[PDB]
Each structure stands twice: as C-alpha cells, then as structure tokens.
Ligand binder design. Structure first.
Ligand code: HEM
Ligand code: HEM
Lengths: 146, 141
C-alpha cells in the first residue's frame, strides 16, 4: 500500500476532528440495525430487540467506542496496519468466527457516519482516501483466514 | 421486500430530495468515479471532467428513475425493467458496482440530509436501492 502525501494529511486532517464515542456508537448501532444478522455476535450485550432498544444499549454504545478507536490506531500509523491488526485478526477469526464480508460493511458504514457528521467537508478526495482506509484495515483484519 | 414502514420512509426522504435530482445524481455518479475508478471503464465514450456536460445529463437520467421507481414502489420491475435489457444485455455492468453507486448515493444524501437519514431511514433507503439493483440485473437470473 503506497500512501500519497495528500492522502495522509487528509485521513488525519479529518481524524483530528472525529468524535470517537458519538461516531463510535452509531456505526455499530447502524450496523446492528442496518444488517440484522450481525446481532448474532453481540447477544451478550443484552437488549438488541428494536431500533430503539439498540440506540439505547450502553454496551453496544460502549463497545462502539473502542471499535472506531481502533481505526484511530489505523490512522496514527498508516504504514504498519498488517501489524497493529495482527493480534485482532486472530480473535475475529479463531474465536468469534466472523465472515470477512462483515469487516467491509462496518467500513462502508464508518464512511456514511463520517460524512453525515462533516457534511460538505468530506470531499470526494476525502472519501477516496477513507474508503481506501476501511478497505485496508478491513483487509488486515482477514489476513488471518489466509 | 419493502415494508409499511419501509415504503413510507423512502418516500418521506425522496420528498426532501428535492428538485435537486440534477446535482444529486450528478454528485453521486462523480463521487463514484473517484472513490471507485475501476467504475470508469464503463464510460469510454463519456467525458469525465468534473462538471462534464454529460455526467450532468446522465445524472438527471439516473436520478429520475430512482424517483420514477419511488413513485411506483409497489411494482418496481416493469418500472425500471426497461433499464434491464440495457444494463444486463448490452452494458454488462458487473453486479458489484450497483453497490458502489448505491453507496455514493447514500453518501450524497447523508451530506445534505443528515438529521433525516436516521438509523431506520438508512435501512429502508438501503432496502429500496437493493431491489432497484436487484431489478436492473434480473436478466442475470
Ligand atoms: C471491520 C471493522 C472492525 C473493527 C475495527 C474491529 C475492532 C475490534 C477490536 C479492537 C476488538 C477488541 C475486543 C475488545 O475490545 O474486547 C473487537 C472485538 C469484537 N468484535 Fe470487532 N472489529 C471489526 C469487525 C467486526 C465484525 C464484522 C464483527 C461482527 C459483525 C465484530 C464483532 C466483534 C465482537 C463480538 C468482539 C468482542 C465483543 C466482546 O466479547 O465483548 N467485529 N473488534
Ligand atoms: C440503481 C442503480 C442504477 C440505476 C437506477 C441506473 C440508471 C440508469 C439510467 C437512468 C440510464 C439512462 C437511460 C437511458 O438514457 O437510456 C442508465 C444508463 C447507463 N448505465 Fe446506469 N444505473 C444504475 C447503475 C449502473 C451501474 C452499476 C453501471 C455500471 C457501472 C451503470 C452504467 C450505465 C451506462 C454505461 C449507461 C449508458 C449511458 C450512456 O452511455 O448514455 N449504471 N442507467
């Protein structure tokens, strides 16, 4: 992965302004709601029985926080993803048994969340970088199936 | 398919378009050119320079069908089906892009109608686009 100069300055040019918890609780909240089946992995989280029930659960919300917090670790070292995500590609593969197709959904949902917030600031170039991001992380997440 | 909740939301959100059909489909097909370049391959005859006269005209084409559809939400097929023989028989759009475009559209909306694209409107809106794409490709099945 060859990172360009304006591709970094942007990633982090946006990150700095990110609400990890707020953005954090949505994407995950939008995921559980958006694609229902993914609620299979979070049953221990308790109530996920209604759109409402979900946007209110403090677990999902809590965890939502360390998810896009981890993407931050993705941003801060845009060169060592396959590593900072080696440990976490095991859990998702040998323990939770989550289909790769679902690391990509969450990524397409991070971007819908990022833009909703930053409205016009999230320029196409902006988007290009950040879709290239979720595609990488996403990738580094599955390397442990291969 | 789409639900009582569903239909009413796609509609409620297609009301707050608005007449913006033009720029919206337009900004959506552009975004889809940069974010996803591989998608340019289908438009060799097309000029793809920001604000290219053409992308303009095709964008109000693409936009006017999504609406068209929204109106007859209860029988989509015969509504876009005609766009079926085009995409499938002639164009041979890789059933994967239909997702990319749907993503850029649901991005455009989310930039202008933030408070209105809530969790539940995100969903339905995605339900809708999925039959829309499920219809234009039918000729595959
Ligand atoms: C693709 C983006 C993803 C990111 C950035 C991510 C990140 C993380 C991280 C850092 C952990 C550490 C576990 C912990 O903090 O206790 C974790 C665990 C976990 N992940 Fe994800 N993961 C992703 C994809 C997924 C997907 C697709 C699913 C299933 C739909 C999933 C379900 C879970 C669950 C259920 C846990 C542990 C929950 C618990 O035991 O309390 N993750 N994830
Ligand atoms: C919901 C999804 C889509 C809708 C609703 C849609 C709608 C349309 C519309 C309204 C037209 C113009 C009809 C005409 O003037 O004959 C068209 C033609 C066309 N579509 Fe799409 N489209 C979608 C997705 C795609 C995808 C995924 C591709 C492939 C990447 C694609 C490629 C094309 C091309 C190349 C044309 C002909 C444009 C020209 O040269 O004039 N479309 N489609």
């Amino acid at each position: 992965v060859q990172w360009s100069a304006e591709e970094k300055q942007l990633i982090s040019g946006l990150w700095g302004k990110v609400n990890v918890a707020d953005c954090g609780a949505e994407a995950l909240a939008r995921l559980l709601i958006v694609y229902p089946w993914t609620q299979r992995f979070f049953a221990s989280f308790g109530n996920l029985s209604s759109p409402t029930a979900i946007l209110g659960n403090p677990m999902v919300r809590a965890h939502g926080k360390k998810v896009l917090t981890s993407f931050g670790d993705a941003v801060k070292n845009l060169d060592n993803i396959k590593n900072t995500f080696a440990q976490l590609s095991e859990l998702h593969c040998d323990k939770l048994h989550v289909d790769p197709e679902n690391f990509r959904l969450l990524g397409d949902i991070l971007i819908i969340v990022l833009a909703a917030h930053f409205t016009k600031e999230f320029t196409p170039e902006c988007q290009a970088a950040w879709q290239k991001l979720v595609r990488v992380v996403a990738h580094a997440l599955a390397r442990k199936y291969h | 398919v789409l639900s009582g909740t569903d239909k009413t939301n796609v509609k409620g959100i297609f009301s707050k378009i608005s007449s913006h059909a033009e720029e919206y489909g337009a900004e959506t097909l552009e975004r889809m050119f940069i974010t996803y370049p591989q998608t340019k391959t289908y438009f060799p005859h097309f000029d793809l320079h920001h604000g290219s006269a053409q992308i303009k005209a095709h964008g109000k084409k693409v936009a006017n069908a999504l609406i068209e559809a929204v109106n007859h939400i209860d029988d989509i097929s015969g509504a876009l089906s005609k766009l079926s023989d085009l995409h499938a028989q002639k164009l041979r759009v890789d059933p994967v892009n239909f997702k990319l475009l749907g993503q850029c559209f649901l991005v455009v909306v989310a930039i202008h109608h933030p408070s209105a694209l809530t969790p539940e409107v995100h969903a339905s809106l995605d339900k809708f686009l999925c039959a829309v794409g499920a219809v234009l490709t039918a000729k595959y099945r």
